[PDB]
Design a protein around this ligand. Structure first.
Ligand SMILES: *[C@@H]1O[C@H](CO[C@@H]2O[C@@H](C)[C@@H](O)[C@@H](O)[C@@H]2O)[C@@H](O[C@@H]2O[C@H](CO)[C@@H](O[C@@H]3O[C@H](CO[C@H]4O[C@H](CO[C@H]5O[C@H](CO)[C@@H](O)[C@H](O)[C@@H]5O)[C@@H](O)[C@H](O)[C@@H]4O)[C@@H](O)[C@H](O[C@H]4O[C@H](CO)[C@@H](O)[C@H](O)[C@@H]4O[C@@H]4O[C@H](CO)[C@@H](O)[C@H](O)[C@H]4NC(C)=O)[C@@H]3O)[C@H](O)[C@H]2NC(C)=O)[C@H](O)[C@H]1NC(C)=O
Ligand SMILES: *[C@@H]1O[C@H](CO)[C@@H](O[C@@H]2O[C@H](CO)[C@@H](O[C@@H]3O[C@H](CO[C@H]4O[C@H](CO[C@H]5O[C@H](CO)[C@@H](O)[C@H](O)[C@@H]5O)[C@@H](O)[C@H](O)[C@@H]4O)[C@@H](O)[C@H](O[C@H]4O[C@H](CO)[C@@H](O)[C@H](O[C@H]5O[C@H](CO)[C@@H](O)[C@H](O)[C@@H]5O)[C@@H]4O)[C@@H]3O)[C@H](O)[C@H]2NC(C)=O)[C@H](O)[C@H]1NC(C)=O
Ligand SMILES: *[C@@H]1O[C@H](CO)[C@@H](O[C@@H]2O[C@H](CO)[C@@H](O[C@@H]3O[C@H](CO[C@H]4O[C@H](CO[C@H]5O[C@H](CO)[C@@H](O)[C@H](O)[C@@H]5O)[C@@H](O)[C@H](O[C@H]5O[C@H](CO)[C@@H](O)[C@H](O)[C@@H]5O)[C@@H]4O)[C@@H](O)[C@H](O[C@H]4O[C@H](CO)[C@@H](O)[C@H](O)[C@@H]4O)[C@@H]3O)[C@H](O)[C@H]2NC(C)=O)[C@H](O)[C@H]1NC(C)=O
Ligand SMILES: *[C@@H]1O[C@H](CO)[C@@H](O[C@@H]2O[C@H](CO)[C@@H](O[C@@H]3O[C@H](CO[C@H]4O[C@H](CO[C@H]5O[C@H](CO)[C@@H](O)[C@H](O)[C@@H]5O)[C@@H](O)[C@H](O)[C@@H]4O)[C@@H](O)[C@H](O[C@H]4O[C@H](CO)[C@@H](O)[C@H](O)[C@@H]4O)[C@@H]3O)[C@H](O)[C@H]2NC(C)=O)[C@H](O)[C@H]1NC(C)=O
Ligand SMILES: *[C@@H]1O[C@H](CO[C@@H]2O[C@@H](C)[C@@H](O)[C@@H](O)[C@@H]2O)[C@@H](O[C@@H]2O[C@H](CO)[C@@H](O[C@@H]3O[C@H](CO[C@H]4O[C@H](CO)[C@@H](O)[C@H](O)[C@@H]4O)[C@@H](O)[C@H](O)[C@@H]3O)[C@H](O)[C@H]2NC(C)=O)[C@H](O)[C@H]1NC(C)=O
Ligand SMILES: *[C@@H]1O[C@H](CO)[C@@H](O[C@@H]2O[C@H](CO)[C@@H](O[C@@H]3O[C@H](CO)[C@@H](O)[C@H](O)[C@@H]3O)[C@H](O)[C@H]2NC(C)=O)[C@H](O)[C@H]1NC(C)=O
Ligand SMILES: *[C@@H]1O[C@H](CO)[C@@H](O[C@@H]2O[C@H](CO)[C@@H](O[C@@H]3O[C@H](CO)[C@@H](O)[C@H](O)[C@@H]3O)[C@H](O)[C@H]2NC(C)=O)[C@H](O)[C@H]1NC(C)=O
Ligand SMILES: *[C@@H]1O[C@H](CO)[C@@H](O[C@@H]2O[C@H](CO)[C@@H](O[C@@H]3O[C@H](CO)[C@@H](O)[C@H](O)[C@@H]3O)[C@H](O)[C@H]2NC(C)=O)[C@H](O)[C@H]1NC(C)=O
Ligand SMILES: *[C@@H]1O[C@H](CO)[C@@H](O[C@@H]2O[C@H](CO)[C@@H](O[C@@H]3O[C@H](CO)[C@@H](O)[C@H](O)[C@@H]3O)[C@H](O)[C@H]2NC(C)=O)[C@H](O)[C@H]1NC(C)=O
Ligand SMILES: *[C@@H]1O[C@H](CO)[C@@H](O[C@@H]2O[C@H](CO)[C@@H](O)[C@H](O)[C@H]2NC(C)=O)[C@H](O)[C@H]1NC(C)=O
Ligand SMILES: *[C@@H]1O[C@H](CO)[C@@H](O)[C@H](O)[C@H]1NC(C)=O
Ligand SMILES: *[C@@H]1O[C@H](CO)[C@@H](O)[C@H](O)[C@H]1NC(C)=O
Ligand SMILES: *[C@@H]1O[C@H](CO)[C@@H](O)[C@H](O)[C@H]1NC(C)=O
Lengths: 134, 452, 134, 134, 53
C-alpha cells in the first residue's frame, strides 16, 4: 500500500486509498537533485522534469473545470448513460480492477469528459445568475 | 485541550541553501558598441525600479567566506570567458621558429623585440614572411642571430581574442530565482561574518562589475565607516585578508606607445593582428597614484588593524615577496591590453605607534595570457591601435601572510592575490540566498464542517 | 509589508498579511523576459524557471489533497497532539516568529503531513457515501 | 464555437461558452510529441512548453487567492467603483465585445486585482476566527 | 588559378546525403497563443482584415 498497493485489488479497495497514488506521482523521482553542465544526463533530466509537470497540469486542468479543484473524489451531477456499461451496482465494484475498467470505457471515455464540463460547470456556475443576489 | 491544527500557505520561513542565479543588466552599449564578453549578446534586462524591502526584528546570520554566491560567480565568469573565445581566430600556425633582433635604440630598456617568422597564407601551398613585434616574457630563449619562440607553444595552445569584443566590465546583477530571496546586510560594521541585525530582502543585487584585478581591487563598493577589515580567520596569518577603502584613491594608468594594426591573412579568412613599427617615440607604461591621498589611506588601515592586531607591534610593509610576476604585480585588463604595474613602490612606507607630487609605478604590457591559472587554452591580445588610458577608482586591497613569527612583535601583510574568487568577495560579503518555505502549520481551536 | 514585511514580526501579525508573501513568489523574478541563444545565461534562466514552478507545484499539490485548493488558511479537522508542543494558546502566537516555529516542528513536521491527508480528505471525501444521495 | 467562436460576439454570449476557451489553451499545441537531439527545433519546443505552463500557472495562481480554485466564474464580494466605468447594467453586456472591454479597464486593471485579494480572501478567510469553533 | 573563397572566408563541403529539397514546414503557435490568418482575398497593404480565422 506504499504505492499502487491496490493495483490488482478491487476498485472499491483501491478507492479506499487513492490518496497515496496521487501524492507520489508529481513529487516523485528525486528531480530536485570539468566545469560544464551540458551533459547528456542533464538534458534528459530537464525534459523528464518538464513532462512531470506538464502531465500533472494536463490532468489538474480537467478537475478545475469540474468543481474538483481540491477534492480527490467529486460526485458529479451528470447522469450515467446505459450504453456505456450494462453492469449493476455491485457487479463492477466487487469484481473488476481499475485496469479492466480503464479498457472498458477507453472507447467512449472522451464522450464522458465533454459532457462533464457542461452540466457540472458550464451550467452550474451559470445557475447562480438568479440565485446569487435576489 | 480541544485544539485543532490549521494550515497556512504564505508563511515567511526559510532555510540556508543555494541554487542557480542569472544576469540582469539594462540597455548599456548595444549599437555604439556590442559583442561584450560579459553581458554576452543578450541578458535579462533589469527593471529601473529597485526591488528592496527593509526587514525588521530579524537577525539572520550571514556568511561570506562560506557563501556560495561567489562560487557560482567564479564559475560563471570562467564558462563565459571560454564561450566568447571559442568562435574566434585560432593562432596555431604562429608557432614557428622565430628569428628576432632587438628594436632600434640607436645601437644602445629593450623589453620588446622586432621579430619575424613565416606563416600560412591564403593558399596552403604558398608561405609568407612577415615582420611583427612581441613583448618580453611572452617569449623565452631556445638554446650570433637571436632565434626565439612563443612561450605558450611549449605548454598550451593559443587562440586570438576577437577584435570587436569589449573587455570593459559592466554592472551584472545577480537576481534570485522564484521561491528564493537574496538577503543583503545593511549593518555598516560587519566585522567577519556573524548575525547582521539590519537585513534587507532584495530580489536583484546592486551594480556588480567583474573587475579582474590583482592585489588591488578597483571600482568596488563600500558604505562608510572605518576602512573595513575582513578575514576568514584572523588568528591564522596564512589566510588571505580582504580590505575595503572608506574612500577610493583615484589612480590613472596608461601606455604611451602609439601602435599600428598590422593585419596578415593566415589561411582563408582569418587575420593575425600584430604590432607594426611604433610611431612617435617609445616610452614605458606607468600608473600614477596620488602620493598625498595614498599616505592617508595607509594610515587609516594601520589604525583599524591596530585594535585588531594587538596595537603594540611594528608595521613592516614590503613588496610582494615570492610569487610570480603576474600574481605579485597589479595585473589587470584595461583598454584591451593587459597591464602589470609594479606594486613594490606603494608599500614601502612604514608607520607605527604615533601641481602636487604623485608616486608612479613602472608597468609592462603582455599580449599572451591565460588568467586565473587556467592551463587549458591561452589567448593572444591584439594590440589596441591608438591611445590608452585607464583612470579607475581603487577601493580594495588584498594582503597575505607575514612569515611564521613566533610571538615577539613586528609584522604586517604584504600584497598577494593568489586566488581570483576572493576578488568577487569584496562585493558579495553581505549577500546570502535562502530557500523560502511557504508552508507552515500551527494549531488553533478551529475546525471546518463536520461531514462533507 | 511589501514582501516579508512581517518576517520578524509575531506569528499573529504575519498571519494578518500572508497573501502578499504568496503572491510574489510564483510570479517573481521577471522571468518572462551573434544569432545563437545557447548562452550560459539562458540555460541558467531556464532551469531557474523550472524549479520556480516545480517548487510551487510541489507545495500546491499538498493543499489540493487537504481541501485547500483555493484558500490561504484552512482549519483542518486533525486534532493536535500534545507531544508536538506544550505551549498554550497565547504562549506561541504572541511570542514566536514563524522562523522560530519552523525549527520547533521541523523534527515532526512530516508526521503532521501524513495525518492531514487521512482525516481531512481520505475520510472526509469518503463520508459522503451515505450522505450524498439517500 | 470550437475555439474563440464568440471572440466577436457579445460579452454575454461569450460568457455562455467560456469553458471551451479555457480547455484548449493549456493542453494545446500537441507538445507531447543522426543520433543527437540538440537541434534548433527541440530548444524552441522546450521553451515554448515552459511559457505554456508558466503563463497558465501565472493566471491560476491568481484565482487560487480569490476563492476560485475550481470555478470558471466567481462572484466576488468587492464593490464596483463608479470611476472604473459609468455604463449601466444592460449598457455594456448587450453592446461590447470582450475585446473592447479589455482596453477599457486595462488602465485600472491592476487596481482591481490588488483589492480582490483583500476583501474576498485576506478578510474572508480571517472572518472565520470567531465563527469556526465557538 | 585560385579558389575565390580562399581570399575572403573559409570553406566546408556540404554533405552528399543531405537533401536540399524544400518540404512544407508548418509554424504552429505555442500554448496560450494563436496565429490569426486573414481570409479576405483582396488584402491590399496591411489594414483591418474583416474575415479572420
Ligand atoms: C622592424 O623590422 C622590420 C622588418 O625589416 C626586415 O628586415 C629588413 C632588412 C628588410 O629586408 C625588410 O624587408 C624585412 O621585413 C622593418 O621594416 C623594414 O625596415 C627596413 C629598414 O631598412 C626597410 O628597408 C628599406 O626599404 C627601402 C624600400 O624597399 C622597399 O621596397 C623594396 C622594393 O622596392 C624597390 O623599388 C623601390 C621604389 O619603388 C625602392 O625604393 C626600393 O629600394 C626597391 O628598389 C623591397 O624589396 C623592400 O623589402 C621594401 O619593401 C629601401 O630603399 C631601403 O634600402 C636602402 O636604404 C637603406 C637606408 O634607408 C640602406 O640601409 C640600404 O642598404 C639600402 O641601400 C641600397 O638601396 C638600393 C636601392 O635600389 C638597393 O638596391 C641596395 O640593395 C641597397 N643596399 C643594400 C645592399 O642594402 C631599406 O632596405 C623596409 O622597407 C621595412 N619593411 C618593408 C616595408 O619592407 C622595421 O623598420 C623594423 N623596425 C623599425 C621601426 O626599425
Ligand atoms: C572601472 O571604471 C572605470 C570608469 O572610468 C573604467 O575605466 C574607463 O572608463 C571610461 C569612461 O569613459 C571608458 O572610456 C570609454 O572609452 C571608449 C574607447 O573606445 C574608443 O575606441 C573604440 C575602438 O577604436 C576605434 O576607434 C579609434 C578612435 O577612437 C581608432 O583609433 C581605432 O582604430 C578604432 O577604429 C571606438 O569604437 C570608440 O568609438 C572609441 O573611439 C570610448 O568609446 C568611450 O566613449 C565615450 O567617451 C568618448 C571620449 O570622451 C566620447 O567621444 C564618446 O562620445 C560619443 O561618440 C563616440 C565617437 O563616435 C562614440 O564612440 C561613443 O559611443 C559616443 O557615441 C563617449 O562619451 C569612453 O571614452 C573606458 O573604456 C573604461 N575602461 C578603461 C580603458 O579603463 C574601468 O575600465 C573600470 N575597471 C577596469 C580597470 O576595468
Ligand atoms: C618593482 O620595482 C621595485 C623598486 O624597488 C623593484 O625592487 C628592486 O629589487 C631589486 C632586486 O631585489 C633591487 O636590485 C638591486 O639592489 C641593489 C642594492 O643596493 C646595494 O648597493 C647599495 C648602494 O645603492 C644605493 O641605492 C640603494 C637603493 O637600491 C640604497 O639603498 C643605498 O643606500 C644606496 O644609496 C648599498 O648602499 C646597499 O646596502 C648598503 O646600504 C644600505 C642602505 O643604507 C644598508 O642598509 C646596508 O646595510 C648596506 O650598508 C646594497 O649593497 C643595487 O645595488 C642594485 O643595482 C644598483 O646599481 C646598478 C648599477 O649602477 C643600478 O643600475 C641600479 O639601478 C642600482 O642603483 C639593484 O638595484 C633593487 O634595488 C630594487 N629597487 C630598485 C629598482 O632600486 C622590483 O624588483 C620591481 N619588480 C619587478 C617586477 O621587477
Ligand atoms: C584559524 O585556523 C587556524 C589553523 O591553524 C586555527 O589555528 C589554531 O592555532 C593554534 C595555535 O596554538 C593551534 O594549536 C595547536 O595546534 C597543534 C597542531 O598539531 C600539530 O602537531 C600534531 C602532533 O605533532 C607533533 O608535534 C606536537 C606539537 O605540539 C606534539 O604535541 C606531538 O606530540 C607531536 O610530536 C599533529 O597531529 C597535527 O597534525 C599538527 O601537525 C596541536 O598539536 C596543539 O594541540 C595542543 O593543544 C590542544 C588543544 O588545547 C590539546 O588538546 C593538545 O593536547 C595539545 O596540548 C594545538 O592545538 C591549533 O591546532 C590551530 N588549529 C588547527 C585547526 O590546527 C585558528 O584557531 C583558526 N581561527 C581562529 C579560531 O582564530
Ligand atoms: C530534533 O531531533 C534531533 C534528533 O532527534 C531524532 O529525530 C526525532 C524526530 C526523534 O525521532 C528522535 O528520536 C531522533 O533521535 C535532535 O538532535 C539532537 O541534537 C543534540 C545536539 O547536537 C544531540 O546531542 C549530542 O550529545 C552527545 C553526547 O551524549 C551525552 O549524553 C549521552 C546520554 O546520556 C551519554 O551517553 C554521552 O556520554 C554524553 O554524556 C554529543 O556527543 C553530540 O555531539 C551531541 O551534542 C542529540 O543526540 C540529538 N538527538 C538525538 C536523540 O540523537 C534535536 O535537538 C531536535 N530538535 C528539537 C528542536 O527538538
Ligand atoms: C622562413 O624563414 C626562415 C628563417 O627563419 C628561412 O630559412 C632560411 O633562413 C636563412 C637565414 O639566413 C635564409 O638565409 C639565406 O641563406 C642562404 C644560404 O646560406 C644565403 O645564400 C642567403 O643569402 C640567405 O642568407 C634562407 O634563405 C632561408 N632558407 C634556406 C633555404 O636556408 C625559411 O626558408 C623561410 N621560409 C620557409 C619556411 O621556407
Ligand atoms: C567579529 O567580531 C566577533 C565578536 O563580536 C568575533 O567573534 C569572536 O571572535 C573571537 C576571536 O575570533 C572568538 O574567540 C576565539 O574563539 C576561538 C574559536 O573560534 C578560540 O579558539 C579562541 O581561543 C578564542 O576563544 C570568539 O569566540 C568569537 N565569539 C564571541 C561570541 O566572542 C569574530 O571572530 C569576528 N570576526 C568575524 C566573524 O568577522
Ligand atoms: C599616433 O600616430 C599616428 C600616425 O602617425 C598619428 O596620426 C597622425 O597625426 C598627425 C597630426 O598632425 C596627422 O597630421 C599630418 O598629416 C600630414 C599628411 O599625412 C603629414 O604630412 C603631417 O606631417 C602630419 O602627420 C597625420 O595625418 C596623422 N596620421 C598619419 C598617417 O601620420 C597620431 O597623431 C599619433 N598619436 C596621436 C593619437 O596623436
Ligand atoms: C491599402 O488601401 C488603403 C485604403 O483602403 C490605404 O490606406 C490609405 O492609403 C493612402 C495612401 O497610402 C493614405 O493617404 C496618404 O496618407 C499618408 C500618410 O500615411 C499621407 O502622407 C499622404 O499625404 C496621404 O494622405 C491614407 O491615409 C490611407 N488611409 C485611409 C483611411 O485612406 C493603404 O495605404 C493601402 N495599403 C496597404 C495598407 O496595403
Ligand atoms: C592602543 O592601546 C592603548 C592602550 O593599550 C589604547 O588606549 C586605551 O587603553 C585602555 C587601557 O588599556 C583601554 O581600556 C582602551 O580600550 C584603549 N582605547 C581604546 C578605545 O581602545 C589605544 O586606544 C589603542 N589604540 C587606538 C588608537 O585605538
Ligand atoms: C638584445 O637583448 C638581449 C636580451 O637578453 C641581449 O641578450 C642581447 O645581447 C641584446 N643584443 C644587442 C646587440 O643589443
Ligand atoms: C588622474 O588624472 C586626472 C585628470 O584630471 C587628474 O586630475 C588626477 O590628479 C590624476 N591622478 C593621478 C594621481 O594619476
Ligand atoms: C496549557 O498547557 C497545559 C500543559 O502544559 C495543558 O494541560 C492546558 O490544557 C493548556 N491550556 C489550555 C488553554 O488548555
Amino acid at each position: 500500500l506504499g504505492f499502487l498497493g491496490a493495483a490488482g485489488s478491487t476498485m472499491g479497495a483501491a478507492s479506499m486509498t487513492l490518496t497515496v497514488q496521487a501524492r507520489n506521482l508529481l513529487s516523485g523521482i528525486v528531480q530536485q537533485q570539468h566545469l560544464l553542465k551540458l551533459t547528456v544526463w542533464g538534458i534528459k533530466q530537464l525534459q523528464a522534469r518538464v513532462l512531470a509537470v506538464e502531465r500533472y497540469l494536463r490532468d489538474q486542468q480537467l478537475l478545475g473545470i469540474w468543481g474538483c479543484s481540491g477534492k480527490l473524489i467529486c460526485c458529479t451531477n451528470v447522469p450515467w448513460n446505459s450504453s456505456w456499461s450494462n453492469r449493476n451496482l455491485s457487479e463492477i465494484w466487487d469484481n473488476m480492477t481499475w485496469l479492466q475498467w480503464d479498457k472498458e470505457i477507453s472507447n467512449y471515455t472522451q464522450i464522458i469528459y465533454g459532457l462533464l464540463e457542461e452540466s457540472q460547470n458550464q451550467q452550474e456556475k451559470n445557475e447562480q445568475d438568479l440565485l446569487a443576489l435576489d | 485541550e480541544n485544539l485543532w491544527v490549521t494550515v497556512y500557505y504564505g508563511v515567511p520561513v526559510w532555510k540556508d541553501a543555494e541554487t542557480t542565479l542569472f544576469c540582469a543588466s539594462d540597455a548599456k552599449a548595444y549599437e555604439t558598441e556590442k559583442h561584450n564578453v560579459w553581458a554576452t549578446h543578450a541578458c535579462v534586462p533589469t527593471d529601473p525600479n529597485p526591488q528592496e524591502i527593509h526587514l525588521e526584528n530579524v537577525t539572520e546570520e550571514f556568511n561570506m567566506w562560506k557563501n556560495n554566491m561567489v562560487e557560482q560567480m567564479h564559475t560563471d565568469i570562467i564558462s563565459l570567458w571560454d564561450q566568447s573565445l571559442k568562435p574566434c581566430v585560432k593562432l596555431t600556425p604562429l608557432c614557428v621558429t622565430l628569428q628576432c633582433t632587438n628594436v632600434t635604440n640607436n645601437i644602445t630598456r629593450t623589453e620588446l623585440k622586432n621579430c619575424s617568422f613565416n606563416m600560412t597564407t591564403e593558399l596552403r601551398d604558398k608561405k609568407q614572411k612577415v615582420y611583427s613585434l612581441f613583448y618580453r616574457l611572452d617569449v623565452v630563449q631556445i638554446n650570433s642571430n637571436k632565434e626565439y619562440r612563443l612561450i605558450n607553444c611549449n605548454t598550451s595552445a593559443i587562440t586570438q581574442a576577437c577584435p570587436k569584443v569589449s573587455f570593459e566590465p559592466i554592472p551584472i546583477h545577480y537576481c534570485a530565482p522564484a521561491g528564493f530571496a537574496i538577503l543583503k546586510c545593511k549593518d555598516k560594521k560587519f566585522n567577519g561574518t556573524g548575525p547582521c541585525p539590519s537585513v534587507s530582502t532584495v530580489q536583484c543585487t546592486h551594480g556588480i562589475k567583474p573587475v579582474v584585478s590583482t592585489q588591488l581591487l578597483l571600482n568596488g563598493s563600500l558604505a562608510e565607516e572605518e576602512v573595513m577589515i575582513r578575514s576568514e580567520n584572523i588568528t591564522n596569518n596564512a589566510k588571505n585578508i580582504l580590505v575595503q577603502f572608506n574612500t577610493p584613491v583615484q589612480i590613472n594608468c596608461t601606455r604611451p606607445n602609439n601602435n599600428t594594426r598590422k593585419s596578415i591573412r593566415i589561411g582563408p579568412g582569418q587575420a593575425f593582428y600584430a604590432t607594426g613599427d611604433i610611431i612617435g617615440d617609445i616610452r614605458q607604461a606607468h600608473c600614477n597614484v596620488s602620493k598625498a591621498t595614498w599616505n592617508e589611506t595607509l594610515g587609516k588601515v594601520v589604525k583599524q588593524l591596530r585594535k585588531h592586531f594587538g596595537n603594540n607591534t611594528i608595521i613592516r610593509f614590503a613588496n610582494s615577496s615570492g610569487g610570480d610576476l603576474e600574481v605579485t604585480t597589479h595585473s589587470f585588463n584595461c583598454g584591451g591590453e593587459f597591464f602589470y604595474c609594479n606594486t613594490s613602490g606603494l608599500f614601502n612606507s612604514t608607520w607605527i605607534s604615533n601641481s602636487n607630487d604623485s608616486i608612479t609605478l613602472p608597468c609592462r604590457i603582455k599580449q599572451i595570457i591565460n588568467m586565473w591559472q587556467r592551463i587549458g587554452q591561452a589567448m593572444y591580445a591584439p594590440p589596441i591601435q591608438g591611445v590608452i588610458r585607464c583612470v579607475s577608482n581603487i577601493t580594495g586591497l588584498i594582503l597575505t601572510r607575514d612569515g611564521g613569527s613566533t610571538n615577539s612583535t613586528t609584522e604586517t601583510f604584504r600584497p598577494g592575490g593568489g586566488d581570483m574568487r576572493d576578488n568577487w568577495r569584496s562585493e558579495l560579503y553581505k549577500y546570502k540566498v535562502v530557500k523560502i518555505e511557504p508552508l507552515g502549520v500551527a494549531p488553533t481551536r478551529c475546525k471546518r464542517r463536520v461531514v462533507g
